Amino acid sequence: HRTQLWFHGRISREESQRLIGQQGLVDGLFLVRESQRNPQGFVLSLCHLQKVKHYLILPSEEEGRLYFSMDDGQTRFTDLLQLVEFHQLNRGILPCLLRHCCTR
Amino acid sequence: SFEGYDNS
Ligand code: NA
């Protein structure tokens, strides 16, 4: 999702941790970025209890149709935006809500 | 759940 403020593109895990740290390690601070290790997937970086958690977002296919998921298909999303919007109100597998957008 | 990530 190119036009989203929480989307930082192809940056590293180290760099996302630095940005979050620089922003106060505030609980609920988050960003999404591309995954190098999982080429057409993403990583949600989320700050909770002064640590930075990293959640893998994998593409997959149902009846040919593409969806994203962090929990091996238990909870499925059309695109990154829906995943992010859902988790601003619902924890799901996350330890907390996505509360603050890390500045890109 | 996935090596090197915090999912579940
Ligand atoms: Na999910």
Author numbering:
A (entry chain A): 426 to 529
B (entry chain M): 1 to 8
From the article:
We show that the G7-B4 peptide binds with an improved binding affinity of KD = 0.83 μM and retains specificity for Grb7-SH2 domain over Grb2, Grb10 and Grb14-SH2 domains. The asymmetric unit consists of six Grb7-SH2 domains, six G7-B4 peptides, 75 water molecules, six malonic acid molecules and six formate molecules (present in the crystallisation conditions). The staple forms close contacts with Met495, Asp496, Asp497 backbone and sidechains in the EF loop of Grb7-SH2 and Ile 518 in the BG loop in the same way as seen for G7-B1. The staple contributes 55 Å2 of the total interaction surface area of 424 Å2. The thioether linkage is well defined in the electron density, positioned across the top of the stapled cyclic peptide, linking residues 1 and 8, but not altering their positions compared to those in the G7-B1 structure.
In this way it plays a role in integrin dependant cell migration via its interaction with focal adhesion kinase and subsequent phosphorylation in focal contacts, consistent with its homology to the C. Elegans protein Mig-10 that is involved in cellular migration. It has been shown that overexpression of Grb7 enhances cell migration, while inhibition of Grb7 lowers the migratory potential of cells and is therefore linked with metastatic spread of cancer cells.
